[PDB]
């Protein structure tokens, strides 16, 4: 099992894509730290399901937009298990509104969490991973970042910023063999980034359906665990049903 004796930290893992990722990394042998901010009951469920299928997991509370909370988050993982092999930055929110009506706090809270959180957690991971001379970071971005989407100037700015950040961090950490990649989901059935745009655009998803959380989790597991993915870095993989090919 490719992640036996490895540690994964997944941010915003109480539900949807993040929950699915936590499960798939555990399935593949990792001990998973399941981070949440408010969904504690759901987060406990994720730990219980990992325990149930034979793995090890624990839930850690932390608001990933907050610099000292991120410090305590990583400190808790190293204290429990001594190392960090895989970080998946998945935590994010939407606060949809046309730009004209977009209030500054709807811009800021999306930027601070979706982009700032990736910065804070990538910084903390880099320290530990540079010391190990190994690691893989996977950031969940989103096709909205590549193509834009009415109502979502904050979300798309953030997810595009996550893609740029991904590439810079790939270049800084490459000399130690640390890989840094992004997975860009399209519209996923149960973790829908824009429920309103899915409807309008279902007609032009070439595969004719929404994606599943478990599918996004597989591309993530591949990037995190497959030896072939040791040579992939600074990339964005769309899993979007052919939504964005350009």
Ligand X SMILES: NC(=O)c1ccc[n+]([C@@H]2O[C@H](COP(=O)([O-])OP(=O)(O)OC[C@H]3O[C@@H](n4cnc5c(N)ncnc54)[C@H](OP(=O)(O)O)[C@@H]3O)[C@@H](O)[C@H]2O)c1
Q: Residue positions in the annotated binding site?
A: 12-15, 17, 37-39, 63-64, 90, 155-159, 186, 188, 190, 192-193
Sheet holding 136-140, edge to edge: 57-61, 31-36, 7-10, 86-89, 136-140, 179-185, 236-239
Nearest residue to 221 via CA among 87, 46, 25: 25
CB 239 within 8 A of CB 219: yes
Piece in contact with a second copy (CB under 8 A), picked from 40-48, 83-91, 143-151, 203-211 = 143-151
Nearest distance from C-beta of residue 150 to a second copy, angstroms: 5
Of 7, 23, 32, 37, the one binding ligand X by CB under 6 A = 37
CB closer to a second copy out of 22 and 124: 124
Piece in contact with ligand X (CB under 6 A), picked from 16-24, 165-173, 198-206, 223-231 = 16-24
Nearest residue to 95 via CA among 148, 152, 47, 33: 152
Which residues line the annotated binding site for NADP(+)?
Answer: 12-15, 17, 37-39, 63-64, 90, 155-159, 186, 188, 190, 192-193
Nearest distance from C-beta of residue 159 to a second copy, angstroms: 6
* Residue 101 φ/ψ, nearest 5 degrees: -105, 0
Site for a second copy in 149-208 (CB under 8 A): 149-154, 156-173
CB 193 within 8 A of CB 142: yes
Q: Does residue 68 touch ligand X according to CB under 6 A? A: no
Q: Does residue 113 touch ligand X according to CB under 6 A? A: yes
CB closer to ligand X out of 44 and 172: 44
* Residue 215 φ/ψ, nearest 5 degrees: -65, -45
> DSSP for 42-78?
HHHHHHHHHHHTT--EEEEE--TTSHHHHHHHHHHHH
Q: Does residue 57 touch ligand X according to CB under 6 A? A: no
Q: Which residues are catalytic?
A: 155
Site for ligand X in 140-179 (CB under 6 A): 140, 142
Of 166, 193, 233, 238, the one binding ligand X by CB under 6 A = 193
**Contacted entry of ligand X, a second copy, none for residue 185, CB cut-off 5 to 8 Å set by kind:** ligand X
- Count of chain residues binding ligand X (CB under 6 A): 32
Which residues in this chain contact a second copy in the complex, by CB under 8 A? 67, 98-100, 102, 104, 107-108, 111, 115-116, 118-120, 122-123, 126-127, 130, 144-154, 156-173, 234
């Amino acid at each position: 099992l490719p992640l036996t004796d490895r540690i994964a930290l997944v941010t915003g893992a109480s539900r949807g894509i993040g929950r699915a990722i936590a499960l798939e990394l555990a399935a593949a042998g990792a001990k998973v730290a399941v981070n949440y901010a408010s969904s504690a009951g759901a987060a406990d469920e994720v730990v219980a399901a990992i325990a149930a299928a034979g793995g090890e997991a624990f839930a850690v509370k932390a608001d990933v937009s907050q610099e000292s909370e991120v410090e305590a988050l990583f400190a808790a993982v190293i204290e429990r298990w001594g190392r960090l092999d895989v970080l998946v930055n998945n935590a994010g929110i939407t606060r949809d509104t046309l730009l004209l009506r977009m209030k500054r706090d709807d811009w800021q809270s999306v930027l601070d969490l979706n982009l700032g959180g990736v910065f804070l957690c990538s910084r903390a991971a880099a320290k530990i991973m540079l010391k190990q001379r190994s690691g893989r970071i996977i950031n969940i971005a989103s096709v909205v970042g590549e193509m834009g989407n009415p109502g979502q100037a904050n979300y798309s700015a953030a997810k595009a910023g996550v893609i740029g950040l991904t590439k810079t961090v790939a270049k800084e950490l490459a000399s130690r063999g640390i890989t840094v990649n992004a997975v860009a989901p399209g519209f996923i059935a149960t973790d829908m980034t824009s429920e309103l745009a899915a409807e309008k655009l279902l007609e032009v998803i070439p595969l004719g359906r929404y994606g599943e959380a478990a599918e996004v989790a597989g591309v993530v597991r591949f990037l995190a665990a497959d030896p072939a993915a040791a040579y992939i870095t600074g990339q964005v993989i769309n899993i979007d049903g052919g939504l964005v090919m350009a």
